[PDB]
Point group: C3
Chain length 334, copies 3
């Protein structure tokens, strides 16, 4: 059917780890869903030491916002590159078919904008990222990536095909940064992106990230910014890594249903302790909380988690269940 | 039902790669299974060059012992930290639900002990490891990890749900060590763990293990300590890596049925050449031997295997089957 | 049945990324399929900078040729090591059962040959590689690896067990090289393999490839050597990595049906954006092209792809489908 006869809905995006409102089960027919993103190059402090990088972002955040649509909707993205930026940008959706995922059609210089439309033919969570020719990994590893979730029209289903409904949804973007280091091991500082470029490339070629972070910084998902839930709540965590393999794990919990490679036509993996999300992929895990307290959600290369930054927290409220776990004899001398 | 009315069984653990006696099919109702482990900090020689590290162990071995229970048993672990140790330790079971997998409830200083109980609600093989706050990867990468197998009450089943029964079971723990190196590349030596700590952290941040070993040392599963089987025997190999991805492969064989991420409610992957066990996971592979001779069981990053130590051997006895493989023309000049 | 009563077919191998002619559905009974490979040690230029390595090849190419047989055929390989070579070689087939995959029976010095036969009992794509005792990773990381596809006798089937038929097949071998570097970071040069060996070992122990390439060189699958297809064509891409994990991705497309770990008794994963092929494994992905133009096929660690060489191109001809993707507003100033 002609695309102009379809309903149009405008969505205003929210900052990760939160997700714009949507329906899990499609309450309308196929729609054109309109999104707007504004590219912002900005300085970002990424660790406790105060290390500052020139970040490249969709909509001011690392990661970019989670977009949510249904299978066989059209996504129409208006991408704006304001004159206050210095670099050329575009967008590649792994959800889309053709033209390097939209990248060949979305090249915007500072002061320009573009509008792309594509049909979301496959259900799943998918990465999107910047991909300007000749400079792809530098943009991606400077923060310029996010995800899109294309839900099946009748929502998520379990391994036997019965409905799974989430009560909350969070989006964790995991970012590998490669801050250039001198012979002594200190982090180098640069006046312009062009002066930074070759040293960025050499740092990248080490294949050894200096920082691995959730939501753009060491400790961004802790303390006052801890994710929250209650005992009994069904939580979906969408997790993306545009460049590098990760292995999420909820310390004290599990992934009850896991799409490790993120595509909903496949049955979920059950009862996972840890799952592998390949670089260039987004995955999703569903968990029902059974105990209260503090949970850590980490990349289970524990060096990556506790030294390089790939750890966040859940604060969960509710009743303690002594049947599931109890201290029989509390720590004491003998 | 009240936990005090359940049967109690005490299990004495054995040193890997062997596994304590158990039943595959549950011959009793749900039980409380009592285990005891004694933490031992000790010097360990880890390679042929005689490199010696201050190891941190459960029960004197790297890896710690494989514990075996059935789905919906209770595990009751008495953890003892004797006064002859120097550090604080605890335990996190990926099998357990709540309190950072038991870690928040098991913090023992030297001279203290504790008893934790938890319900084994999910069937699978799972990692356990030490996780003291602020120092997690150092303890884990010093050897302080093992695994627990929670069998389904009616044993293992194949992809179509028919019984799979193993005749032997082995447990291979793969350990990544990060021995600190100077500018020349030699391995540094330290007087106390506290003097070692920052250099341990910096070595860990390289993300490049100096040693990757099975059962605590280069060549621990070779020669007189080679795993054994006979042609026709069904062998289960449980394989864990608490920190880093591995990819097991039986040179000359296959994984007939493989739970790569280790959770038995999922159907196994069939006929695997090599399988990926994510860091922070335990997996299990079942193979029926069809040929005699020497097999190597390796991490199939072959550098990790043959230079850094992640290789062991099976010696298999029995009849050679010329139908499956034969030398038609033996190596000769022309 | 006695092997001498079976039909014999001789196959002449072709250079990757092309694949010798075969039938997907087995048009004969079980056969002995005869292959010949000649080992060739040669100099190879692997990057745009002109870096030259002493390569070790099966049949003159990196990767070696894709062999294709059907489940329960016999593979009979005549392996020739001519007197003009310097090193000892053998072959291990992950497809085979026993004697280190054939490696214990195929040790050929220069001037010698051997003939091995094995039964292809398991359907799938499998790695083969050189594995001389004491020197395995050096040979494998010098190019001495390929793959074999053992098709099910009734061809490939989808997740529901209905026929999947490919119109074209390509084989991409991904090779990690570890070219030794001095303190300044330049690539060292060597007079003989024996003088190269320890420095090869030390470079390998970094676990950081200097080059990651498709079909033996940076840009080998671009330009005039781009893979091709037409809109509507069903393409199977077989992808192997003998030593190191990879994560293939078709920029602008998907893996419609993916055997990530490559074994055809398992149902395929659907609609993959990116998939993980563990080191020591071969995988296969099936895609029906829906849009024309240039596609990049990359390892989606984008540093590995665009800086270290793990990127190739598809040129696809046909009709542009505006329904699937269109530029609504082309890039312009506002
Ligand atoms: Cu950009
Ligand atoms: Cu991409
Ligand atoms: Cu400890
Ligand atoms: Cu853990
Ligand atoms: Cu060789
Ligand atoms: Cu191999």
């Amino acid at each position: 059917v002609d695309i102009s006869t379809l309903p149009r809905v405008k969505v205003d995006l929210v900052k990760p780890p939160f997700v714009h409102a949507h329906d899990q089960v499609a309450k309308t027919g196929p729609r054109v869903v309109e999104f707007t993103m504004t590219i912002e190059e900005k300085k970002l402090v990424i660790d406790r030491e105060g290390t500052e990088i020139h970040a490249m972002t969709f909509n001011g955040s690392v990661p970019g916002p989670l977009m949510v649509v249904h299978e066989n909707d059209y996504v129409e993205l208006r991408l704006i590159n304001p004159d206050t930026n210095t670099l050329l940008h575009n967008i590649d959706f792994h959800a889309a078919t053709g033209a390097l995922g939209g990248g060949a059609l979305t090249q915007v210089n500072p002061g320009e904008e573009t509008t792309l439309r594509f049909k979301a033919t496959k259900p799943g969570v998918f990465v999107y990222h910047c991909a300007p020719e000749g400079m792809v990994p530098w943009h991606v590893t400077s923060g310029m990536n996010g995800a899109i979730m294309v839900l099946p029209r009748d929502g998520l289903k379990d391994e036997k095909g019965q409905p799974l409904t989430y009560d909350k949804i969070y989006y964790v973007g995991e970012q590998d940064f490669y801050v250039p280091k001198d012979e002594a091991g200190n982090y180098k500082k640069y006046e312009t992106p062009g002066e930074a470029y070759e040293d960025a490339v050499k740092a990248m070629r080490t294949l050894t990230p200096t920082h691995i972070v959730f939501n753009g910084a060491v400790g961004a998902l802790t303390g006052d910014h801890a994710l929250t839930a209650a005992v009994g709540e069904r939580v979906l965590v969408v997790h993306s890594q545009a460049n590098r393999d990760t292995r999420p794990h909820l310390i004290g919990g599990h992934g009850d249903y896991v799409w490790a490679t993120g595509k909903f036509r496949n049955p979920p993996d059950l009862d996972q302790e840890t799952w592998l999300i390949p670089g260039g992929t987004a995955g999703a895990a569903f968990y029902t909380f059974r105990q209260p307290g503090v949970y850590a959600y980490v990349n289970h290369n524990l060096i990556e988690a506790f030294e390089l930054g790939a750890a966040g927290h859940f604060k969960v409220t509710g009743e303690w269940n002594d049947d599931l776990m109890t201290s029989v004899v509390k720590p004491a001398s003998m």
